[PDB]
């Protein structure tokens, strides 16, 4: 009944999704790097006021104990996708296989949610691009980007938002196939130091890793079988100590 949105423009383009990539292109930059023994995802926190407490606005998010996410675009669209992404990991895979899904199966499911918003009446496509990063026993370490289209891509490194073309040029110039996780952290902190809109310190910067297992963070002992979280979100003191090594 003349009802759909995101119909085809005569040059073979989807139109509304193109406008949804202009909303993504306006966000505070986020980026991700894959190393030999770990991965890094990073972004800046932009305050609406200096009275705001940005310990409340997390931008880097745990999806499963071995998978992290970050966005550029509309943060509200990203709070709603992250909670569906968490529900998906448990309901589709953990509750059937007693183990969490890989970072290719969860990226497919997030992308399936964003594709369904393009092919609908009544709904606009998402205003976010998501970087999803993680580890699995047989695939190893991985990084993926997901766009408003529901297209997903495996990346060695990437960036999204305002500073993304200069970030992606720095990531091409600096990436090599023998990086380690302390190296990738330094490259990511260097890349955000160019893209930063505000002040640069451990309070304005979000940074997470999927690295080795951390048996401290499992919060209970007695089960070696359970190795403990690969995903760790850098503390504001560690970020300031690494920002003293810069």
């Amino acid at each position: 009944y003349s009802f759909s949105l995101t119909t085809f423009s005569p040059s073979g383009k989807l139109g509304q999704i193109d406008y949804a990539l202009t909303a993504v292109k306006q966000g505070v930059t986020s980026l991700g790097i894959k190393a030999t023994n770990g991965v890094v995802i990073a972004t800046e926190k932009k305050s609406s006021s200096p009275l705001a407490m940005s310990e409340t606005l997390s931008k880097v998010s745990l999806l499963t104990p071995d998978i992290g996410a970050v966005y550029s675009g509309m943060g509200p669209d990203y709070r709603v996708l992250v909670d569906k992404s968490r529900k998906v990991a448990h309901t589709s895979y953990k509750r059937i296989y007693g183990e969490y899904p890989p970072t290719k199966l969860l990226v497919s499911e997030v992308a399936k949610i964003m594709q369904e918003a393009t092919q609908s009446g009544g709904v606009r496509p998402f205003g976010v691009s998501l970087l999803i990063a993680g580890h699995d026993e047989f695939n190893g370490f991985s990084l993926y980007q997901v766009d408003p289209s529901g297209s997903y891509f495996p990346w060695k490194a990437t960036a999204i938002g305002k500073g993304s073309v200069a970030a992606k040029t720095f990531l091409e110039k600096r990436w090599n196939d023998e990086l380690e996780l302390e190296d990738a952290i330094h490259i990511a902190l260097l890349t955000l130091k160019e893209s930063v809109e505000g002040e640069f310190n451990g309070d304005t910067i979000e940074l997470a890793i999927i690295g080795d297992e951390n048996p401290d963070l499992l919060g209970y002992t007695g089960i070696p079988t359970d190795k403990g979280p690969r995903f760790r979100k850098l503390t504001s003191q560690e970020i300031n100590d690494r920002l003293e090594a810069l």
Binding site: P50, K162, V165, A166, T169, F170, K173, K193, E194, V196, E197, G198, E199, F200, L246
Partner: protein
């Protein structure tokens, strides 16, 4: 009927319907362009709008709406002239509502075309006022400006109030001293309250909006101060230093550096002061002048069209050179003290950008003092005689020591951009925004010789010749125009000669060194450096003979 319609149009201006507001503004500027905004009443103590005009308007409208032709309507010429004279007493309350509507439009999400049209109508109104009505409107446009509630949103239409203030200062040089003094006091207060002390990039913060208002008002007012600037020149220079010392937010540096452009520009620019519909409060046309002489033979009269011009004084050029060499030395010396001990800090880059930005806006504005042929000295028939200050002959130019002093500074700023390019490419070769600022500095340095090419097309406090030609042109009728349109046509003529003056030249080794750096940056691996640098390269090839050979080599 017309002044009744004018106040009905002004009171109907709307903040929701941007299309109705556009069609009301077409009517208001069309009324304004043909009518003198003047009280014609002869000290006839019996006259009133409510007691002569509005009764006759109701009788004529009622006759016409009954079904009768206006040819049947009879009235005495006595009542008709009293009702016309009474119609002219209503203008000061119309302007009170007009300023009040203008301050409500500052917060609306308007299109650039309608903001420009609103500036055109506000300025055409001002040029149509006698000194009585205008003095009331000028004291009305400054009282509302200080006492507003009207700059609340994320991105205000500052132009809708600040271009009108600059047009007040174009008509009356005497207003500038108290307006500028009061602005810079309100700027100093906002910097003390902490405006511009929290970093952001690509957005003005809502804590900064009043500081941006007073700075953009200062930029616009300064661009129209002309010779009234001589009085408070020392104060403005010592305030400019303070403004560069105390605010370091990147989005505010572009605004605070444009203050020097606007200050320098007024001193050395040649332009029309007077666009008035009728001049001086003192010319021979009788008060029977309600249509703007448009269909008369004496519209063309030299005594009607005795325009008055800003032609630069020797005192204003000596101030211009003095501001230029003072603010450029200041920025050179400040960046050179940061070239010792670089830091990768976000502050260190934003400080470097500020002084470099300031050194680009000292080259703008003083741009009218430079001269493409200086490098030939160490015939030539220019048909277009753009008004220069040092003279049209080579002989005149080099026999003034201020011509050499101006060229010395151009060269010394250009040599600093090369000394900066080696610093940034050696220490900071990833840092895109200070390369974009350097490339804008190099673009201005290559292009703006003896003419102004940036700040040429952006909205300003002169009336638009295409807008007033669209209002007053009529097919198969010859020059159906008023004095305002003849004035801006004479301004457009001199402006054309300045922009038709050829800048093509042969290099002096400094242009080659800097062109080779533009070619290097055009070949750079970052999109945000190479795309600007390729655009700069296109412009710098236009400036130099044989430049394509040097690029392909």
């Amino acid at each position: 009927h017309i002044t009744n319609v004018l106040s009905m149009l002004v009171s109907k201006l709307d903040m929701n319907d941007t299309n109705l507001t556009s069609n009301l503004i077409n009517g208001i500027v069309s009324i304004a362009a043909f009518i003198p905004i003047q009280d014609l009443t002869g000290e006839d103590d019996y006259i009133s709008f409510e007691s002569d005009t509005l009764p006759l308007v109701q009788q004529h409208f009622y006759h016409i709406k009954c079904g009768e032709s206006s040819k049947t309507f009879r009235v005495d010429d006595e009542l008709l002239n009293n009702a016309f004279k009474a119609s002219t007493t209503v203008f000061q309350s119309m302007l009170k509502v007009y300023v009040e509507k203008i301050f409500q439009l500052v917060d609306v999400d308007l299109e650039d075309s309608l903001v420009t049209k609103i500036n055109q109508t506000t300025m055409i109104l001002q040029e149509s006022m006698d000194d009585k009505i205008f003095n009331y409107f000028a004291s009305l446009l400054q009282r509302n400006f200080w006492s507003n509630d009207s700059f609340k949103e994320k991105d205000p239409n500052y132009e809708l109030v600040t271009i009108p203030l600059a047009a007040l200062v174009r008509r009356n040089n005497g207003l500038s001293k108290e307006l500028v003094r009061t602005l810079l006091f309100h700027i100093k207060e906002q910097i003390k309250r902490g405006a511009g002390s929290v970093r952001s990039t690509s957005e003005i913060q809502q804590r900064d909006v009043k500081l941006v208002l007073y700075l953009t008002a200062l930029n616009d007012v300064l661009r129209q101060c002309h010779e009234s600037l001589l009085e408070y020149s020392d104060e403005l220079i010592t305030f400019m230093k303070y403004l560069y010392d105390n605010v370091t937010n990147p989005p505010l540096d572009v605004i605070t550096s444009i203050v020097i452009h606007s200050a320098l520009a007024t001193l050395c620019t040649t332009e029309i002061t007077d666009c008035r519909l009728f001049p001086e409060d003192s010319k021979i046309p009788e008060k029977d002048r309600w249509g703007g002489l448009q269909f008369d033979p004496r519209r063309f009269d030299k005594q009607h069209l005795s325009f008055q011009w800003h032609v630069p004084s020797s005192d204003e050029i000596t101030l211009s050179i003095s501001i230029l060499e003072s603010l450029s030395e200041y920025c050179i010396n400040n960046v050179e003290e940061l070239m010792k001990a670089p830091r990768h800090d976000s502050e260190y880059g934003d400080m470097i950008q500020k002084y470099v930005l300031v050194m680009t806006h000292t080259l703008s504005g003083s741009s009218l003092l430079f001269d493409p042929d200086f490098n030939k000295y160490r015939r030539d028939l220019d048909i277009y005689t753009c008004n220069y200050y040092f003279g049209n002959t080579t002989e005149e130019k080099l026999q003034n020591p201020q011509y050499l002093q101006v060229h010395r500074v151009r060269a010394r700023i250009g040599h600093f951009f090369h000394k900066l390019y080696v610093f940034l490419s050696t220490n900071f070769e990833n840092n895109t925004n200070m390369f974009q600022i350097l490339l804008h500095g190099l673009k201005v340095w290559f292009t703006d010789l003896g003419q102004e090419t940036v700040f040429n097309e952006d909205p300003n406090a002169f009336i638009d010749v295409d807008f007033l030609e669209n209002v007053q042109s009529l097919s198969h009728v010859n020059e159906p125009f008023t004095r305002t349109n003849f004035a801006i046509r004479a301004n457009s003529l001199h402006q054309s000669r300045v922009l038709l003056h050829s800048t093509n030249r042969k290099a002096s080794k400094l242009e080659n060194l800097l062109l080779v750096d533009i070619i290097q940056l055009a070949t750079s691996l970052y999109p945000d450096i190479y795309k600007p640098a390729q655009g700069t390269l296109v412009h710098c090839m236009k400036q130099l003979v044989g430049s394509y050979g040097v690029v392909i080599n």
